[PDB]
Design a binder for this molecule. Structure first.
Ligand code: AGS
Ligand code: AGS
Lengths: 228, 359, 150, 239, 380
């Protein structure tokens, strides 16, 4: 029984945005942790086949030289927003000679998180984790399809976010360090993933005021995993 | 050497099974009973060894009972034995026999076995492991305590062999087979759907371990009939009764259910949930290899003139089914006995191809 | 030769009716424990109380006391104490079931299993010896009943 | 124009038409493709031709550049549209930057077009799935596939079309590094994979290769016959 | 052999030994008592219209014969011979002997449950609040009329249930019907659809007859959409008999001398085409609903279907629950059983994790084209 797609609920919410919040849940997990040393971040790739070449799946993409990101669930709706967010950060540094802070980036994205309509189509289906180091120190940011953007100190998303948030609130406090948070994230990863944790499953992305750019090539991941 | 003593004592037990005054007691039971034993109808039962009955005209009586037969074989809506002179309950009458049963129960060994099915080999093991291996071999499931899969939907385009698969399961069987085509659930009287459904599954649950095969059930929604009351608002209630009868209350039992459709997308998905039906099986148009088995088996019992090639017929239609193969393999024989022959030439197959396909 | 063939059950029940069955058991019992014990002692205990008269059942119980005296899982010998009602058996199964240290639970079905005589003979010879005094605790009274009611 | 949203989310979190337009891919012809290290190879099976007609128009493998190659599944008309737009885009890239067009760019273009096509107002999603094989600068063979969702996704061998699970199961027990040692063996490996797929009479086996410093060569179906013959000879040598 | 031949000899020895009593002793288990029941009476039953004044002088319609004015016999009570009362009347002298229960329409007699299907509360774990509320309504006043009296309230005499299909409605009903202690009465919603006009009304009449006779009972309604949901009025005169049945269900439920010690449970799959006269509380008070088990519910239902089956306990269950975001307990049951069926492909006695992964991608991702709940979550 097909109603108009821009119909609220008998209870109050909407429909299609709520169905988007449901559509997040099938996606792969991701974990980002704010630390005053810098923002660390982790994700799972969910490798399916051995024919599937592993280094091509993107989860952490690059918005600015100091603003990172991670995506979830649908890949390509996220790709549009990543491209556009990059464009708008370039417009800000151009017309202002300065760095668009991460909150202003995410305001610019959730301005049209919901412009879905028939004139002037569907709501987007991706949850995003935004990091980076602005002038306000490190920042970790989380949005949703509904544009309800909030700051989170260490948010975990997607399919395993219940036990991830719970066991994350077990281990987290305010004065953590970097590497402790990195292994604290990947312990949660290899409790919530399904396959054996190895060199090809996960990927990290850490950005620091000292380690100036988010840089994470392979096989330091090997050194981090053999430290478990 | 246990055969001698075991046979002697077992025959003694069998003759003491027939060894169960006494003739005077039989004559006294016959004295209590009248000779014109009249037939009545129960309505209610009162626990003080006398109850209410109902005669054939409508008159009703509080009558006692000649209690040697099991009165607890009787329910409301039962047939009793009554007297003329005192109307008392003479005793139990065995049940009337049995137009719904004799119509809806296939009694006979009903056609050929798995030697006739044309190259499926994977669907077959699924219906095998869902009906045959559970019922005939109920020993694996005890080991794991896993209940067998309940319902099986056969579906696919027409001509693929749903009917054959049902007949082949009905061949190699040990259970009572119950066949109702689904189009018989549309009646020109109001409120006749649930009566058919409750009688069908009453027969199934009362008789035996059974297989209720319900064929072409998708035609119950996409076929409105003028010979009907208010259509969709009775058909929906019929489907709802079938639903509740299939997965409702009170310990369902040893009843297997197999259904077969052409289209599946016009079904109310409330039947198609698990708990009711666990296996959904696709029947595609097979290949160009098992067609050789189909033409081979449907030409396995004929004087085939060897101047023909079956690969000439495989290439012919790109989406032929076993229906087309049977149609050609019989129409060629009809062309053969049109001219008093035994063996079948190539032009017989050509005329049969031009008769079956393009008309 | 049927120890070579190794399918018991029928050779056993044939060789009952020829003690002969005594040297048959201690001659046969070296390796296989649960086939002779479970199979032979099940079918021949049940068929011995069922069909067979009483005096060969004593040979069942005494030579089964021999091979089960060789063997572990002592409630086979305690059911031999059920059919025998012997007083040496409870001393042997208490030096042996103290040798195998559940414990109060075999106190429980010990006291349930035993009749009127052997807990008083048991509490007098174990009133002499007792070896830890915990069999004077368990195997007279009060310790079949102390775990249950709470 | 047509102010409507065709593709709505599900109540349980799906796009009906993206997940469901994969079925149209699932009911098309099969096509495999592997990369060797120096010679790339791909080809389609199940032409399911009438064996007695023209065949130069039903070609399911085309090219966009002298560097890049095509394959697809699903229905052919949407492939025709996407290929026309891809040719225009790669040549317009050659208009600007003076390189030969990288394969990753054209796959991102195809997937981006497909996603903004599914997103838009009342446009039915493309029920195809392409294979884009090319070897860009410094000779690196790479191969990507598409999806009606619009996820470019790099593989090492292919599994699309009818019965792709069986074909990937054969490639699973056939992932030998030895197979990509001899170019001829890689060709024979495609032939053996497609032989573990459909009739493979040597009629609907249309295959084309590129040795990464040349253009695509469509093979004349007598060489493929000798390839199948030596495959059958090695299969007899297995016993 | 020895057990077989010796059991044959012993059992047939007892049989051929009692054969001496069989051939030596020469139904009558009641024969003298039945011939003392020959001075009893045929006792035809009737129906009473009214009484008369200063005297009994009773008036009776028999059933078909005629209507007679009668008198009572001496072994009766002059009080309980009120009007509309099926009494047994002498055939010869036409006199009233015993009043009896009324006509019950025996096709309505066969929907009292008469048994108890074995379904325990443990089988619906992961739905704790729903179990709590439905417990609070159904179980507590029949077992403890203590808090409900000493505080001075009335418990909600009606509870409706709904949700997506296969969510546990039927199963919760059966769980109550195990521990009911009352006269639990099943009603399928299609039982009220008969060939003739206003006949289902009489069925509802007889339902509440049985309900008012036996105190402290339960009536379960099931799939009430057939009973009637909407009163769409046009120039056609379509669904109307169903509508009158629904109205007669309304009035004899609650209004003008309410129901007594009866509780009604309804259960539908689509609670959206319902006339709001049913949605008025006082008839259907608590709207208890079954949503999908969110995350821990499916872990618990895996514990339910997995506790008595041959698995390898070294595996986890949380990873299994994480792949089933919108799924019912029925699909969980299919996953467990199908993982067993994949274990039957080989010859094993314990499951593997891979068996359950085969089961997940066999049930959910394959038959998710049907899946039964993308168009019932919207409650179409
Ligand atoms: N796979 C097959 N192998 C051999 N014969 C077949 C096969 N499929 C169908 N047939 C032939 O088709 C007949 C059976 O008809 P079905 O294919 O079962 O018809 P049907 O299409 O299932 O009818 P429905 O169920 O109403 S669609 C047999 O007599 C066979 O000759
Ligand atoms: N929450 C649950 N926990 C455990 N088992 C469940 C649960 N929900 C369903 N099941 C199982 O799946 C079966 C189907 O549930 P039912 O309540 O019988 O479905 P239903 O109530 O008939 O739904 P319909 O089709 O709308 S009447 C139950 O009988 C249980 O065996």
């Amino acid at each position: 029984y097909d109603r108009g797609v821009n119909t609220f609920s008998p209870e109050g919410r909407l429909f299609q945005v709520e169905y988007a919040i449901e559509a997040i849940k099938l996606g792969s997990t991701a974990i980002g942790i704010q630390t005053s040393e810098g923002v660390c971040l982790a994700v799972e790739k969910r490798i399916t086949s051995p024919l599937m070449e592993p280094s091509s799946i993107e989860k952490i993409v690059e918005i600015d030289a100091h603003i990172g990101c991670a995506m979830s669930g649908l890949i390509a709706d996220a790709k549009t927003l990543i491209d556009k967010a990059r464009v708008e950060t370039q417009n800000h540094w151009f017309t202002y000679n300065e760095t668009m802070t991460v909150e202003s980036v995410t305001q610019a994205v959730s301005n049209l998180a919901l412009q879905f309509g028939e004139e002037d189509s569907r709501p987007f289906g991706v949850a995003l984790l935004f990091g980076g180091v602005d002038e306000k120190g490190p920042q970790l940011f989380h949005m949703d399809p509904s544009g309800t953007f909030v700051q989170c100190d260490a948010r975990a998303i997607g399919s395993a976010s219940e036990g991830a948030q719970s066991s994350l609130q077990e281990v987290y406090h305010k004065s953590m360090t970097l590497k402790e948070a990195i292994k604290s994230s990947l312990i949660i990863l290899k409790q919530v993933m399904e396959e054996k944790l190895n060199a090809t499953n996960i990927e990290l992305a850490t950005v620091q005021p000292g380690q100036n750019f988010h840089m994470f090539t392979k096989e330091e991941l090997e050194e981090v995993i053999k430290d478990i | 050497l246990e055969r001698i003593k075991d046979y002697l004592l077992m025959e003694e037990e069998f003759i003491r099974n027939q060894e169960q005054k006494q003739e005077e007691e039989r004559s006294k039971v016959d004295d209590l009973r009248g000779t014109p034993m009249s037939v009545g109808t129960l309505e209610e039962i009162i626990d003080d060894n006398h109850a209410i009955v109902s005669t054939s005209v409508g008159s009703e009586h509080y009558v006692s009972i000649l209690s040697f037969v099991d009165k607890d074989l009787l329910e409301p809506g039962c047939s009793v034995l009554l007297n003329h002179k005192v109307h008392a309950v003479i005793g139990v009458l065995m049940d009337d026999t049995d137009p719904l049963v004799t119509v809806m129960k296939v009694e006979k060994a009903p056609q050929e076995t798995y030697a006739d099915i044309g190259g499926l080999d994977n669907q077959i093991q699924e219906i095998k492991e869902s009906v045959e291996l559970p019922l005939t071999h109920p020993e694996y499931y005890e080991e794991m305590g896993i209940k067998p899969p309940k319902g099986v939907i056969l579906y696919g385009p027409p001509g693929t062999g749903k009917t054959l698969l049902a007949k082949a399961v009905a061949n190699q069987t040990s259970a009572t087979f119950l066949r109702v085509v689904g189009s018989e659930l549309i009646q020109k009287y109001l409120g006749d759907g649930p009566k058919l459904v409750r009688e069908l599954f009453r027969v199934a649950e009362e008789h035996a371990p059974s297989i209720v095969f319900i064929d072409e059930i998708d035609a119950i929604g996409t076929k409105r009939y003028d010979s009907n009351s208010g259509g969709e608002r009775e058909i929906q209630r019929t489907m709802l009764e079938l639903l509740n009868q299939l997965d409702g209350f009170d310990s369902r039992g040893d009843v297997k259910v197999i259904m077969a459709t052409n289209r599946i997308e016009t079904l109310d998905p409330a039947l198609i949930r698990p708990g009711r039906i666990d296996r959904k099986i696709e029947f595609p148009l097979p290949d160009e290899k098992t067609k050789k088995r189909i033409f081979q088996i449907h030409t396995s019992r004929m004087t085939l003139a060897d101047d023909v090639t079956l690969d000439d017929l495989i290439m012919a239609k790109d989406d032929l089914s076993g229906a087309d193969i049977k149609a050609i393999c019989t129409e060629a024989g009809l062309m053969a006995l049109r001219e008093r022959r035994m063996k079948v030439t190539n032009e017989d197959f050509k005329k049969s191809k031009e008769n079956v396909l393009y008309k | 030769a049927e120890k070579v063939q190794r399918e018991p059950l029928l050779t056993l029940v044939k060789e009952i009716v020829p003690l002969l069955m005594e040297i048959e058991q201690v001659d046969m019992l070296e390796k296989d424990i649960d086939e002779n014990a479970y199979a032979k002692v099940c079918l021949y205990l049940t068929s011995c109380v069922n069909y067979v008269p009483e005096p060969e059942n004593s040979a069942l119980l005494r030579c089964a006391l021999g091979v089960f005296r060789k063997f572990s899982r002592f409630p086979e010998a305690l059911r031999l104490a059920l059919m025998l009602n012997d007083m040496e058996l409870v001393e042997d199964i208490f030096t042996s079931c103290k040798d195998v240290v559940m414990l109060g639970r075999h106190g429980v079905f010990l006291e349930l299993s035993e009749d009127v005589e052997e807990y008083e003979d048991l509490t007098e010879i174990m009133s002499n010896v007792q070896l830890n005094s915990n069999f004077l605790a368990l195997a007279r009274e009060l310790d079949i009943m102390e775990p249950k009611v709470p | 124009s047509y102010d409507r949203a065709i593709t709505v989310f599900s109540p349980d979190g799906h796009l009906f038409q993206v997940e469901y337009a994969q079925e149209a891919v699932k009911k098309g012809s099969t096509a495999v493709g592997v990369r060797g290290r120096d010679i790339v190879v791909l080809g389609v099976e199940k032409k399911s031709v009438a064996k007695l007609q023209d065949e130069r128009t039903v070609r399911k493998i085309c090219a966009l550049d002298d560097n890049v190659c095509m394959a697809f599944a699903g229905l052919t008309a949407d492939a025709r549209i996407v290929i026309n737009r891809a040719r225009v885009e790669c040549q317009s890239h050659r208009l600007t930057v003076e390189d030969p067009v990288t394969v990753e760019y054209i796959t991102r273009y195809i997937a981006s077009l497909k996603q903004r096509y599914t997103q838009s107002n009342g446009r039915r999603p493309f029920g195809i799935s392409a294979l884009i094989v090319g070897f860009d600068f410094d000779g690196t063979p790479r191969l990507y596939q598409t999806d009606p969702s619009g996820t470019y996704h790099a593989w090492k061998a292919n599994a699309i079309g009818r019965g792709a699970k069986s074909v990937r199961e054969f490639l699973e027990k056939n992932y030998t590094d030895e197979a990509i040692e001899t170019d001829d063996l890689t060709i024979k490996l495609v032939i053996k994979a497609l032989l573990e797929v459909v009739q493979s009479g040597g009629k609907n086996i249309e295959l084309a290769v590129m040795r990464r410093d040349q253009s695509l060569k469509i093979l004349n179906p007598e060489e493929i016959e000798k390839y199948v013959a030596e495959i059958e000879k090695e299969k007899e040598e297995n016993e | 052999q020895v057990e077989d031949d010796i059991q044959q000899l012993l059992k047939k020895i007892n049989e051929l030994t009692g054969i001496k009593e069989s051939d030596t002793g020469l139904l009558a288990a009641d024969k003298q008592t039945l011939q003392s029941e020959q001075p009893l009476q045929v006792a035809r039953c009737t129906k009473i219209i009214n009484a008369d004044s200063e005297d009994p002088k009773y008036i009776i319609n028999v059933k078909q014969f005629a209507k007679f004015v009668v008198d009572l016999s001496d072994q009766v009570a002059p009080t309980d011979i009120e009007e509309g009362m099926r009494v047994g009347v002498d055939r010869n002298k036409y006199q009233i002997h015993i009043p009896l229960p009324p006509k019950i329409d025996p096709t309505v007699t066969m929907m009292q449950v008469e048994e108890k299907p074995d379904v325990t509360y443990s089988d619906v774990g992961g739905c704790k609040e729903q179990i709590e509320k439905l417990r609070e309504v159904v179980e507590t006043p029949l077992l403890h009329p203590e808090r409900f009296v000493n505080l001075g309230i009335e418990p909600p005499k009606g509870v409706l249930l709904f949700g997506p299909p296969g969510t546990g409605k039927t199963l919760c009903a059966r769980a109550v019907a195990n521990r009911t202690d009352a006269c639990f009465i099943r009603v399928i919603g299609s039982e009220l659809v008969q060939k003739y006009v206003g006949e289902g009304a009489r069925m509802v009449r007889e339902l509440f007859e049985m309900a008012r006779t036996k105190k402290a009972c339960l009536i379960f309604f099931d799939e009430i959409d057939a009973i009637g949901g909407a009163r769409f009025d046009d120039g056609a005169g379509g669904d109307n008999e169903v509508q009158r049945t629904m109205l007669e269900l309304i009035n004899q439920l609650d209004g003008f001398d309410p129901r007594g010690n009866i509780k009604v449970l309804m259960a539908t799959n689509r609670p959206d085409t319902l006339d709001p006269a049913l949605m008025r509380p006082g008839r259907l008070d608590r709207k208890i609903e079954f949503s999908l088990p969110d995350l821990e519910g499916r872990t618990h239902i895996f514990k339910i279907h997995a506790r008595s089956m041959s698995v390898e306990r070294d595996i986890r269950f949380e990873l299994l629950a994480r792949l089933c975001p919108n799924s019912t307990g029925a699909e969980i049951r299919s996953v467990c059983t199908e993982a067993g069926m994949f274990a039957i492909r080989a010859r094993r006695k314990i499951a593997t994790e891979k068996d359950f992964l085969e089961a997940v991608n066999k049930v959910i991702k394959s038959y998710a084209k049907f899946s039964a709940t993308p168009r019932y979550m919207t409650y179409n």
